[PDB]
């Protein structure tokens, strides 16, 4: 009668035998691959034990948030710029976390081995967890912070702006639309292994540097779950390595996945980090090279070399286009600041020095433009000026990549500047690179996303903002602002007086 029990590994020992054979026991989703029936998983968990380990993490996390952090007024003592950055960082990641739920549900359906299915399942639950965690950061900052607007309604106010569209490409549709294997590459092999895992940590660093201890508390907890997801992605390649189709399609799906993720995160992450902060942690360029090249593109991807996996063929172009991409993008995000759900600021004197120091030639291009916009009164409501007007006066059209949704100004960009315009069956299409162009030419029906200029054509700016609820609780002040100060906030009237009417820039072509 010696006190005994049973643990997770003791039950998991027989989990593989749970599945049985029958005619229709097959994946309901289209795929070019065949996942091995005997593929195994790295961690031996069962529902009860999975719940326990996550519950333990939750107690520390919520305990810290509700008790000490609240007593310290941690939701307030953060730099204004970082409070805004988290509205975007947390809500956008939230959707990546959310889609990853549906994504892993689809992988679980694909896997035929009970153990491989179980690995995916644990992630499905983790992604629900992560969705709720990211939601909690916005929920917490809205409740205790300096500016709840945007934190409190991002789920509907993000729809007003162009940066959101690209987010849905890499972290929404890219995660669930296509061959299950292609989706696994976008999500696990590239999405998390290359950007998410290092990003989550990097975010906690920039956060702590700007006084934010809320995000480190939640994200460091999210980070503890990623290892298992890394294994899922790795096991995905293993399960399909001994299949003839693997050698024929794996590298192609990987290269596409790589470009898709990088195209959006290379400029957007670097932008939120360097322009959405006061205290800098590290120059994005070096952070990128370490993540994409060294860590992922070499070490992590090299291991799976024995499975046919090779280094992405667009990797070289990705690097050449990275250096200035985020700088090119902030110009556009600031010019279109009225379409956001957050407040933006011009670089300050100390920041400009830092930028010039780390990116020689930054001042002669971007610096001067920002100085000009300031002189035009871009921060002041009574100026009647919006940076967008400057692009018009100087014949600098802004286009939207039909595939990635990333905005670009080819005539002004210091990085890439290869605009491609096509007409097909009565519709005009604009591309910014040769990789996304091939994607559309080969798969036109996969990329029919209407851009903001197409949807907003002929509409007066303030009408779009009003219709999509881009206002603060007073019903007059805009959520988005061109400066992060507490006074002289633009109202809907200030925008209406500008009488800015959207136009589809592609209609100029004959």
């Amino acid at each position: 009668r010696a006190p005994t029990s049973v643990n997770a590994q003791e039950v998991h020992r027989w989990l593989q035998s749970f599945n049985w054979d029958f005619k229709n026991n097959r994946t309901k989703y289209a795929t070019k691959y065949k996942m091995a029936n005997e593929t195994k998983e790295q961690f031996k968990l069962i529902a009860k034990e999975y719940a326990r380990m996550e519950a333990v993490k939750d107690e520390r996390q919520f305990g810290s948030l509700q008790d000490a952090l609240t007593r310290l007024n941690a939701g307030v003592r953060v730099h204004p710029k970082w409070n805004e950055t988290m509205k975007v960082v947390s809500n956008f990641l939230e959707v990546g976390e959310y889609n990853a739920i549906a994504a892993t549900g689809m992988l679980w359906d694909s896997a035929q081995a009970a153990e491989q299915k179980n690995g995916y399942l644990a992630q499905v639950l983790d992604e629900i967890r992560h969705t709720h965690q990211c939601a909690y950061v916005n929920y917490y900052f809205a409740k205790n912070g300096q500016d709840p607007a945007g934190h409190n309604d991002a789920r509907r106010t993000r729809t007003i702006g162009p940066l959101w569209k690209g987010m849905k490409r890499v972290f929404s549709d890219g995660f669930i639309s296509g061959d299950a294997v292609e989706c696994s590459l976008n999500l696990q092999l590239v999405g998390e292994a290359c950007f998410t895992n290092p990003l989550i940590v990097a975010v906690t660093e920039w956060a702590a540097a700007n006084g934010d201890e809320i995000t480190p508390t939640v994200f460091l907890s999210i980070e503890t779950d990623e290892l298992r997801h890394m294994a899922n992605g790795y096991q995905t390649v293993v399960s399909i390595a001994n299949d003839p189709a693997s050698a024929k399609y794996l590298n192609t799906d990987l290269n596409n996945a790589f470009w898709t993720q990088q195209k959006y995160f290379t400029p957007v992450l670097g932008m939120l980090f360097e322009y959405g902060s006061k205290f800098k942690v590290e120059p994005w360029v070096k952070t990128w090279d370490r993540w994409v090249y060294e860590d992922w593109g070499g070490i992590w991807i090299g291991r799976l070399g024995k499975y046919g996996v090779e280094s992405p063929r667009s990797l070289k172009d990705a690097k050449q286009d990275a250096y200035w991409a985020h700088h090119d993008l902030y110009l556009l995000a600031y010019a279109l600041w009225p379409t956001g759900f957050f407040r933006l600021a011009l670089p300050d004197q100390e920041e400009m020095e830092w930028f010039e120091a780390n990116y020689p030639g930054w001042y002669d291009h971007y610096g001067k433009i920002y100085e000009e916009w300031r002189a035009r009164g871009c921060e002041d409501p009574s100026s009647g000026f919006i940076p967008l007007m400057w692009f018009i006066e100087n014949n600098h059209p802004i286009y939207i990549d039909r595939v990635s949704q990333v905005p670009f100004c080819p005539s002004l960009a210091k990085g890439a500047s290869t605009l491609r315009v096509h007409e097909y069956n009565g519709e005009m299409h604009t591309f910014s690179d040769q990789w996304g162009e091939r994607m559309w030419l080969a798969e036109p029906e996969r990329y029919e996303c209407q851009n903001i200029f197409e949807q907003y054509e002929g509409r007066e700016l303030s009408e779009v903002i009003a219709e999509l609820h881009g206002l603060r609780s007073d019903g007059k002040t805009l959520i988005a602002q061109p400066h992060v100060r507490g006074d002289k906030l633009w109202t809907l009237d200030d925008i209406k007086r500008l009488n800015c009417v959207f136009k589809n820039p592609v209609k100029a072509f004959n």
Partner: protein, 388 residues
């Protein structure tokens, strides 16, 4: 070093001073409630609703969505990431559903973790108290090891039937509910195996291998029609609602409730088995928790939809008729297990009464909600034909 090298803006004098200098005198908006625009199901908006509703980025062309425009990347061929085409049911708003237990991830794993620890304590006290002594050997080695064991595959199959809904559900609230209903099913299958593994530890010669229970499930007669139904629900149904509805509002409500409650839970005690009832208590609590969610989604939101009420009931009645036949067949084959019991264990009257209890609870909790005309004696009579 004692202080470390990384300076933090919250505690670093110089950095904090810069931060405090840039702060506004008061918040830039007095509305400090995330999700304030969500229509509350109850008196006040709940943490569950705020953290969940609208997390799914649907555009307005998928009922209830707040976004606009097509998806950025679709499947080869053109299929949308999420779309109306994935289910026959229609509604005015896919975001109306609410789990009555208001379970978001934190509360969900908290409760399951408590149950996990309670379970561990239970088994240690059970083995230490030597209660295994009073359990009938035949019941233990035949009915628990082989027949209760085989049922794990039934619960496992139902778990898998949720995979497509996890991928296709048209809203956050439905995705989360569906995911939790499915996760509870895999948990139960693992608790059945946990019990077998526990017995292998406190009972010399008890083999915890699944070979026997699996052979019973795959090739036996008692569970033949149950397996055929489970194989169908899981792999022949591509509609995520037909799947969830038919599993919980038809098959598991009739077959599952009968096996767990009217067979094993009802007879286990008669053979000195207080072990299995412990795990069945969990499965039944899970069943009742899921039922609340299933009722809210299919009856409160869809079956009573102000615009598609009639349509949705017609569809669910269709599904009920479609899956009631395979479910009756499953119960009919299961009737064969009663002949395996030692004479005098139970009789035809008890078996019939127990079938009527399950059928009557089903008519009340489910069939009646969509006006499905179920004939209780006809259903029972069809099942009793399986008694040998």
């Amino acid at each position: 070093s004692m202080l470390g090298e990384r300076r933090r803006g919250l505690t670093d004098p110089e950095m904090a001073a810069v931060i405090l200098k840039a702060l506004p005198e008061a918040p830039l908006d007095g509305n400090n409630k995330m999700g304030y625009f969500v229509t509350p199901r109850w008196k006040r908006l709940t943490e569950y609703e705020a953290l969940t509703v609208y997390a799914q980025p649907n555009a307005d062309w998928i009922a209830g969505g707040l976004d606009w425009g097509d998806w950025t990347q679709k499947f080869h061929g053109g299929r949308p990431s999420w779309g109306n085409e994935t289910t026959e049911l229609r509604t005015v708003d896919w975001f109306k559903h609410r789990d009555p237990l208001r379970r978001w991830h934190a509360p969900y794993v908290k409760d399951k973790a408590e149950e996990w620890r309670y379970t561990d304590r239970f088994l240690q006290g059970y083995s230490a108290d030597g209660q295994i002594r009073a359990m009938n050997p035949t019941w233990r080695d035949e009915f628990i090891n082989r027949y209760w064991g085989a049922f794990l595959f039934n619960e496992y199959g139902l778990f898998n039937a949720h995979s497509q809904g996890a991928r296709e559900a048209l809203s956050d609230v439905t995705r989360v509910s569906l995911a939790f209903w499915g996760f509870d099913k895999i948990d139960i299958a693992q608790m059945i195996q946990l019990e077998r593994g526990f017995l292998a530890k406190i009972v010399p010669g008890f083999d915890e291998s699944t070979a026997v229970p699996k052979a019973e499930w795959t090739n036996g007669e008692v569970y033949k029609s149950a397996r055929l139904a489970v194989e169908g629900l899981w792999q022949e149904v591509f509609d995520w609602n037909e799947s969830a509805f038919s599993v919980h509002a038809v098959y598991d409500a009739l077959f599952g409730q009968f096996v767990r409650r009217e067979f094993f839970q009802r007879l286990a005690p008669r053979f000195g088995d207080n072990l299995t009832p412990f795990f069945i208590n969990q499965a039944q609590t899970y069943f009742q928790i899921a039922k609340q969610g299933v009722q809210d989604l299919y009856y409160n939101c869809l079956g009573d939809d102000p615009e598609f009420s009639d349509y949705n009931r017609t569809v669910m009645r269709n599904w009920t008729g479609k899956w009631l036949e395979p479910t009756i067949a499953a119960l009919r084959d299961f009737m064969g297990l009663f002949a395996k019991l030692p004479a005098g264990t139970t009789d035809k009257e008890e078996i019939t009464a127990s079938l009527y209890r399950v059928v009557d609870d089903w008519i009340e909790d489910y069939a009646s909600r969509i006006d499905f005309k179920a004939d209780r004696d006809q259903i029972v009579k069809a099942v009793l034909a399986g008694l040998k």
